[PDB]
DNA sequence: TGTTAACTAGTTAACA
DNA sequence: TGTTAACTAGTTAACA
């Protein structure tokens, strides 16, 4: 049962489980003590980079604006982000981090890198020629999900 | 580079996934619409008469998720109860007739999705096929 | 074991 | 655009 097709399926199935019911894949658990949802972390990492609106965050994360609304209303209660109002001739509602939020931001940021580093640890382990064969595979499959 | 592509791959999936727990290419063709998880159950019962706690072991979900799914399935009259010959307390679920097509279908969708998986693997040569298939293996270790 | 209830993190739709 | 309300398919925990 070592078939290639079955080898793929079993590895899609394997990742579904590992992810549990979250929507992102990282290695190890969060440095902060079981603080927020991954999606709530990731949003804070985005806000550190650049402050934004509901619809922007929705697109970055490929989730609905209702989902973003709820995430933000939570992040707010944890006094982790502030709104801006539409007060001035601005009319835009902009959400930025709070002092309390930058530590966790860096926590999540780095946590994404470690995971990448590991992939990178897994990466160079093949020969350069072997690598570009992978890259052509990934690309073929990813297209099957489009 | 490369890792970025992996990641990107993983992330492409999380999206194709949504709330579903497995991954199938193309829309379900079932004459009746159920959650994939509901369909997969009917496929399961077609192999072996089974209890809640086993369906829950096979789907890796919780028994509460199973109770719910099973009540909805029962709501459309696709399954039926029966007790174990060993212990009469023990409740075993099996397909009604109206269910055999559907279970067939959801088996077919796994198949037609494996077919699609094969079409793609074949476009690489066996030289390239086992270098990749031991890449998958090398990756599944971070996940165990 | 498996049912409930209370909860979660997302969905669609309607609507200022 | 983005909040809210009604929904959904899972979760954990208590306990019938
Ligand atoms: Zn993230
Ligand atoms: Zn299935």
Query: Do A90 and A125 fall within a single domain?
Result: no
Please give the backbone phi and psi of residue B89, each rounded to the nearest 5 degrees, phi first. Answer: -65, -35
Query: Do B39 and B92 fall within a single domain?
Result: yes
Alpha-carbon span A121 to A27, nearest angstrom: 13
Query: Do A90 and A121 fall within a single domain?
Result: no
Dihedral sign from CA coordinates of B28, B30, B33, B38 = negative
- Between B14, B114, B132, which is nearest A25 by CB? B14
Does residue A6 sit in helix, strand or coil?
helix
Query: Do B58 and B38 fall within a single domain?
Result: yes
Residues across chain A: 146
End-to-end CA distance of chain A: 28
Hey, are the CB atoms on A8 and B129 less than 8 Å from each other?
no
Does residue A33 sit in helix, strand or coil?
coil
C-alpha closest to that of B123 among A139, A106, A81, A65? A139
Query: Do A27 and A41 fall within a single domain?
Result: no
CA A104 – C1' C2 distance (Å)? 40
C-alpha closest to that of B18 among B41, B43, B35, B39? B35
C-alpha closest to that of A83 among A100, A95, A70? A95
Query: Do A66 and A109 fall within a single domain?
Result: no
Residue B7 token pair:
């990641």
Q: Give strand letter and number of the nucleotide nearest B71 (CA to C1').
A: C3
For chain B, the maximum distance between any two Cα atoms, rounded to a whole number of angstroms, is 60
When divided into structural domains, chain B yields a total of: 3
Query: Do B71 and B85 fall within a single domain?
Result: yes
Alpha-carbon span B136 to A139, nearest angstrom: 14
The enclosing H or E element of B128 equals: helix B126-143
Q: How many CB atoms lie within 10 A of CB A19?
A: 19
- Can you name the residues that pair with B137 across neighbouring β-strands? none
**What residue numbers bound the domain in which A16 lies?**
1-35
Pairing of strands A81-82, B94-95: unpaired
Is A21 near strand D, with its CB below 7 A from some atom of it?
A: yes
Query: Do A19 and A48 fall within a single domain?
Result: no
Query: Do B40 and B85 fall within a single domain?
Result: yes
Query: Do B7 and B26 fall within a single domain?
Result: yes
Query: Do B129 and B86 fall within a single domain?
Result: no
């Amino acid at each position: 049962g070592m078939s290639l097709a079955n080898q793929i399926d079993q590895f899609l199935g394997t990742i579904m489980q590992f992810a549990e019911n979250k929507h992102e894949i990282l290695l190890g658990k969060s440095e902060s003590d079981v603080k927020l949802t991954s999606t709530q972390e990731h949003i804070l990492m985005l806000l550190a980079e650049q402050i934004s609106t509901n619809a922007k965050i929705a697109e970055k994360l490929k989730i609905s604006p209702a989902a973003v609304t709820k995430a933000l209303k939570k992040l707010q209660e944890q006094e982790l982000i502030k709104s801006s109002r539409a007060t001035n001739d601005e009319r835009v509602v902009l959400w930025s981090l709070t002092e309390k939020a930058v530590p966790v931001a860096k926590e999540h940021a780095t946590h994404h890198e470690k995971t990448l580093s590991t992939y990178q640890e897994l990466g160079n382990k093949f020969t350069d020629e072997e690598q570009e064969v992978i890259s052509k595979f990934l690309s073929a499959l990813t297209e099957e999900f489009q």
